[PDB]
Amino acid sequence: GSVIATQMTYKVYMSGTVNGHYFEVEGDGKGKPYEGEQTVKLTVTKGGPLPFAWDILSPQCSIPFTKYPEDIPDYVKQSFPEGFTWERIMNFEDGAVCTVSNDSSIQGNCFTYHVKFSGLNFPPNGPVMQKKTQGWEPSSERLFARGGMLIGNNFMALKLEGGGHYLCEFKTTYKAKKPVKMPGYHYVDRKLDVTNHNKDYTSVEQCEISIARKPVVA
Amino acid sequence: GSVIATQMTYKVYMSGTVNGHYFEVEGDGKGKPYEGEQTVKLTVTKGGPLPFAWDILSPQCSIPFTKYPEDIPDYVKQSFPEGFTWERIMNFEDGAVCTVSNDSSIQGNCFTYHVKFSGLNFPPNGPVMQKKTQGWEPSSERLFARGGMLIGNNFMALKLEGGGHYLCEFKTTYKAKKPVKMPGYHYVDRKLDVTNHNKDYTSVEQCEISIARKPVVA
Amino acid sequence: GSVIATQMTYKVYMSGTVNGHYFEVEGDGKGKPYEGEQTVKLTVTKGGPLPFAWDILSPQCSIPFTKYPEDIPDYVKQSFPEGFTWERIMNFEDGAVCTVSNDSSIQGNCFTYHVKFSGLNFPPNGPVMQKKTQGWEPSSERLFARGGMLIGNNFMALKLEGGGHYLCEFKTTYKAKKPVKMPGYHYVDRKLDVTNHNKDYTSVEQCEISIARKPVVA
Amino acid sequence: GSVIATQMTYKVYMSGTVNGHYFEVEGDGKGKPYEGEQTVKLTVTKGGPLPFAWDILSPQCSIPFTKYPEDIPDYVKQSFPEGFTWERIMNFEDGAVCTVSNDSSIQGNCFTYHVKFSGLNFPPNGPVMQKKTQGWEPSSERLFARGGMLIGNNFMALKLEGGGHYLCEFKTTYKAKKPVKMPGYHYVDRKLDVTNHNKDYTSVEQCEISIARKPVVA
Ligand SMILES: [Cl-]
Ligand SMILES: [Cl-]
Ligand SMILES: [Cl-]
Ligand SMILES: [Cl-]
Ligand SMILES: [Cl-]
Ligand SMILES: [Cl-]
Ligand SMILES: [Cl-]
Ligand SMILES: [Cl-]
Numbered sequence: 116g117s118v119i120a121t122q123m124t125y126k127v128y129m130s131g132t133v134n135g136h137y138f139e140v141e142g143d144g145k146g147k148p149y150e151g152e153q154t155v156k157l158t159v160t161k162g163g164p165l166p167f168a169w170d171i172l173s174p175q176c177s178i179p180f181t182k183y184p185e186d187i188p189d190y191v192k193q194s195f196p197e198g199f200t201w202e203r204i205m206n207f208e209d210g211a212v213c214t215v216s217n218d219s220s221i222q223g224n225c226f227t228y229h230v231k232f233s234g235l236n237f238p239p240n241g242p243v244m245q246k247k248t249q250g251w252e253p254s255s256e257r258l259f260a261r262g263g264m265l266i267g268n269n270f271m272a273l274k275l276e277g278g279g280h281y282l283c284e285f286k287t288t289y290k291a292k293k294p295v296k297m298p299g300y301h302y303v304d305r306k307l308d309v310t311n312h313n314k315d316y317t318s319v320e321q322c323e324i325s326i327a328r329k330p331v332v333a
Numbered sequence: 334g335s336v337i338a339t340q341m342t343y344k345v346y347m348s349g350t351v352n353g354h355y356f357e358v359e360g361d362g363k364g365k366p367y368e369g370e371q372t373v374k375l376t377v378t379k380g381g382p383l384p385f386a387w388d389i390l391s392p393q394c395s396i397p398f399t400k401y402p403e404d405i406p407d408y409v410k411q412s413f414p415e416g417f418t419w420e421r422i423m424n425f426e427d428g429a430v431c432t433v434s435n436d437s438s439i440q441g442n443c444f445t446y447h448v449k450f451s452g453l454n455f456p457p458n459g460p461v462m463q464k465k466t467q468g469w470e471p472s473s474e475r476l477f478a479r480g481g482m483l484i485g486n487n488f489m490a491l492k493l494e495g496g497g498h499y500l501c502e503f504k505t506t507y508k509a510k511k512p513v514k515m516p517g518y519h520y521v522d523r524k525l526d527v528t529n530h531n532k533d534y535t536s537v538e539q540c541e542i543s544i545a546r547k548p549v550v551a
Numbered sequence: 552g553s554v555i556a557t558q559m560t561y562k563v564y565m566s567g568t569v570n571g572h573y574f575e576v577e578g579d580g581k582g583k584p585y586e587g588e589q590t591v592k593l594t595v596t597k598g599g600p601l602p603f604a605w606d607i608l609s610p611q612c613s614i615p616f617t618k619y620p621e622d623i624p625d626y627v628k629q630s631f632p633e634g635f636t637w638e639r640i641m642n643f644e645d646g647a648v649c650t651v652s653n654d655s656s657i658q659g660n661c662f663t664y665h666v667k668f669s670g671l672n673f674p675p676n677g678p679v680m681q682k683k684t685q686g687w688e689p690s691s692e693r694l695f696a697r698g699g700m701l702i703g704n705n706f707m708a709l710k711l712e713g714g715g716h717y718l719c720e721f722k723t724t725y726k727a728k729k730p731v732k733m734p735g736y737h738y739v740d741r742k743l744d745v746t747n748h749n750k751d752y753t754s755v756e757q758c759e760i761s762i763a764r765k766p767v768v769a
Numbered sequence: 770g771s772v773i774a775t776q777m778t779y780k781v782y783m784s785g786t787v788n789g790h791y792f793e794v795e796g797d798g799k800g801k802p803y804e805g806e807q808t809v810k811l812t813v814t815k816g817g818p819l820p821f822a823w824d825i826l827s828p829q830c831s832i833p834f835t836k837y838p839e840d841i842p843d844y845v846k847q848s849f850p851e852g853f854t855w856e857r858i859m860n861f862e863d864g865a866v867c868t869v870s871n872d873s874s875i876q877g878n879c880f881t882y883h884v885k886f887s888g889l890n891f892p893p894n895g896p897v898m899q900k901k902t903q904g905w906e907p908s909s910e911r912l913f914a915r916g917g918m919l920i921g922n923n924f925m926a927l928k929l930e931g932g933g934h935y936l937c938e939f940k941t942t943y944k945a946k947k948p949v950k951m952p953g954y955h956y957v958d959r960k961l962d963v964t965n966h967n968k969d970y971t972s973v974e975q976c977e978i979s980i981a982r983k984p985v986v987a
Contacts, residue, residue: 132870132885134856134870135854135856135870135871135872137885200789202788202789202889202890203889204866204889204890208646210644212858212866212868213868214866214867214868214887214888214889216786216788216789216887216889217789218789231786231791231887233868233870233885233887234868235856235857235858235868235870235942236856236858236940236942238916239916252477252518252548253518253548253549253550253551254548255473255475255520255548255549257473257488257490259470259490259498261497261498262892262893268488268502270475270486270488272475272477272518279479280477280479280518284486286890288889288890300470300471300490300498302473304548304549304550305550306548306550306551324550325550326549326550328549330470330471330472330473330522330524331471331473331522331544331546331549332471332522332523332524332542332543332544333471333524350652350667352638352652353636353638353652353653353654355667418571420570420571420671420672421671422648422671422672426864428862430640430648430650431650432648432649432650432669432670432671434568434570434571434669434671435571436571449568449573449669451650451652451667451669452650453638453639453640453650453652453724454638454640454722454724456698457698480674480675504672506671506672688913688954688984689954689984689985689986689987690984691909691911691956691984691985693909693924693926695906695926695934697933697934704924704938706911706922706924708911708913708954715915716913716915716954720922736906736907736926736934738909740984740985740986741986742984742986742987760986761986762985762986764985766906766907766908766909766958766960767907767909767958767980767982767985768907768958768959768960768978768979768980769907769960
């Protein structure tokens with residue numbers, strides 16, 4: 116409540132590989148953590164232009180910016196100033212798999228995100244390597260507590276050029292760097308929109324709204 | 334609209350195996366399909382008492398009873414009177430796997446469900462064979478259209494005796510027996526409660542509420 | 552050694568569903584269990600002609616007929632006369648999944664196999680429903696002991712019409728009906744050949760050679 | 770045949786993360802590529818001592834050193850001097866997942882391997898984070914050709930302290946940097962032994978024997 120301002124900014128430092136292609140990305144964002152609203156601008160600082168769809172990286176560029184009701188303990192925020200980290204597995208329906216690790220720290224009014232992205236087995240003629248994806252459908256992450264950690268499961272889906280979907284299952288484990296009050300079985304709905312970008316996506320702007328809630332039908 | 338009364342009844346005829354144990358179940362239910370409210374009474378007619386947790390069978394005992402808004406085409410209802418079928422895969426976090434097939438038909442004011450359940454690899458000392466489960470947490474099924482079919486993905490979870498959860502991923506493919514108007518990316522929230530049962534669950538009563546909706550944060 | 556003749560015969564009684572299609576199969580086979588050589592004739596007694604590739608059922612039609620060296624304890628044979636059962640999960644690379652349960656008993660010189668097959672989510676335009684498969688490539692099952700059971704993992708592959716492969720991962724758990732001497736980490740190589748069949752595969756003849764061995768490079 | 774000496778040496782440059790823990794490793798090895806025999810010495814140059822079992826990294830430290838019969842085209846060797854790369858997915862039975870990318874180049878009598886390792890979701894009280902593993906059981910990789918690539922599937926297993934096994938499924942895709950003669954359905958048996966190491970595994974010596982063969986029972 117005192118550790119996180121109503122208006123925060125954050126920096127993203129991501130590096131990784133996709134089918135063996137190394138790359139680096141830097142971002143500058145801001146938003147209202149208690150409102151669940153945020154925005155960020157990314158810049159491919161190395162390895163660009165990327166030979167793959169930007170969409171697989173968009174969800175890797177900020178959990179603190181999630182609107183949690185008062186009756187539902189905010190796992191991520193509580194962890195600060197200590198901070199926290201998250202580990203993610205992404206299984207695409209065509210065999211591709213990604214493992215992503217994050218470390219979230221805080222310094223005053225700014226959050227710092229260090230991210231390592233590892234993605235491979237993306238079919239050369241698939242939607243990713245052919246850049247045929249058109250953003251993510253809004254999602255709903257199932258979250259529960261286990262071993263002092265918060266685990267989130269999400270059935271994500273990328274909109275395909277000309278109609279259709281490219282499926283991907285998300286599993287993210289959030290690990291606070293200090294004991295916090297564990298939440299109950301809940302969900303976080305999100306809508307991530309790429310609001311701007313250049314011709315080759317070496318520059319991108321993203322908009323995200325994340326709101327937590329109890330089961331709709333309890 | 335004319336094929337399905339506001340108040341319907343249905344019969345369930347299920348047979349199958351769990352770790353090689355054959356069994357048979359018969360049910361009698363009713364509800365308001367357009368209200369998404371239903372109830373059913375099950376009776377283990379063969380193989381009882383079952384040496385496993387009833388909870389794995391509860392979700393196998395009625396899609397027509399789902400409240401769909403008017404702006405979201407009801408895939409299942411449209412299929413009638415022709416009817417439809419569904420195929421389901423259940424992956425429990427401890428290795429157990431179940432495949433379930435259903436056939437839904439209609440005769441006047443009564444729906445008939447024929448179900449075949451195949452479940453195996455349930456650890457002998459696990460929550461299922463030890464009957465340590467305590468009902469399902471409310472769920473949220475992600476649904477989209479593909480190849481004239483409706484596919485649903487759900488991150489289900491069984492409440493464990495003494496706290497904790499026993500996870501299970503659901504994937505259900507709904508196949509209408511006739512071309513129908515396909516729906517867009519949506520969800521169906523549910524809460525399935527075992528409202529009554531005898532000492533050995535050879536007799537069970539279930540309550541279910543299923544409501545469809547558009548993404549909470551679009 | 553006394554419970555199993557050098558020349559045995561067996562009967563197969565299989566029933567099940569594939570994408571909701573019920574069927575029944577009966578078989579009559581024979582072979583030399585200690586030689587790992589066997590043959591069997593199948594007859595679709597119900598639900599035929601099957602609207603799917605026979606190949607998915609061929610591996611479901613006899614572990615006792617496996618040549619085990621003397622330095623490697625034969626898990627399956629030891630279980631007799633008590634017998635044993637096995638549970639199997641089949642994951643095809645295109646999403647299809649099958650769960651199979653078996654019960655193996657013995658009466659004199661004849662083994663009796665009761666089998667329940669549940670398969671679904673086979674794409675309508677896939678190799679299975681389109682009958683474009685041409686038999687299994689020889690396989691190698693990785694076997695080890697756990698909880699008094701023997702678990703086998705196999706990377707199977709169906710030869711496709713015109714070249715190529717249709718992959719399927721096999722996981723089989725063998726459960727002896729009585730405590731037996733557990734084996735060490737080993738393998739069983741097999742070659743299953745459809746030696747004869749009629750136009751619509753309502754009648755089939757299969758040939759199988761199964762030999763156990765220690766790791767080739769220890 | 771002329772591009773690869775009968776006696777080669779190689780250098781390994783690996784970096785990565787495990788549950789968010791960054792690390793770096795350097796290796797110096799040698800062996801007889803056509804004999805399938807090789808050895809290598811690893812040194813944790815950064816992030817050591819590693820808080821996890823070394824065994825998960827041992828298989829990441831040399832395909833060129835595999836003995837292929839003459840009747841079976843050597844995919845990896847043919848690719849040189851152009852070289853090749855490989856992408857790997859590792860699924861441990863307790864939920865942990867690793868994605869590994871490699872790039873193999875050649876300069877005279879020395880192979881250079883650049884490796885990126887990403888592993889996460891290793892349970893804090895599991896065999897890996899608790900360093901309770903004792904080397905890999907010998908393995909057998911199922912290999913076949915697809916899309917000009919060679920795909921290998923392996924059912925690996927880590928020996929546990931006090932008996933038992935910690936399972937892990939391997940899937941490796943080999944991508945030659947130039948068109949080569951594709952091989953048929955075959956296998957590669959291996960035995961990887963940690964021949965020496967210091968108290969905290971910041972220094973390790975490994976021995977590997979890899980031999981290719983046709984199906985044992987064709
Ligand atoms: Cl907890
Ligand atoms: Cl809560
Ligand atoms: Cl459609
Ligand atoms: Cl809609
Ligand atoms: Cl054992
Ligand atoms: Cl042995
Ligand atoms: Cl090819
Ligand atoms: Cl070959």
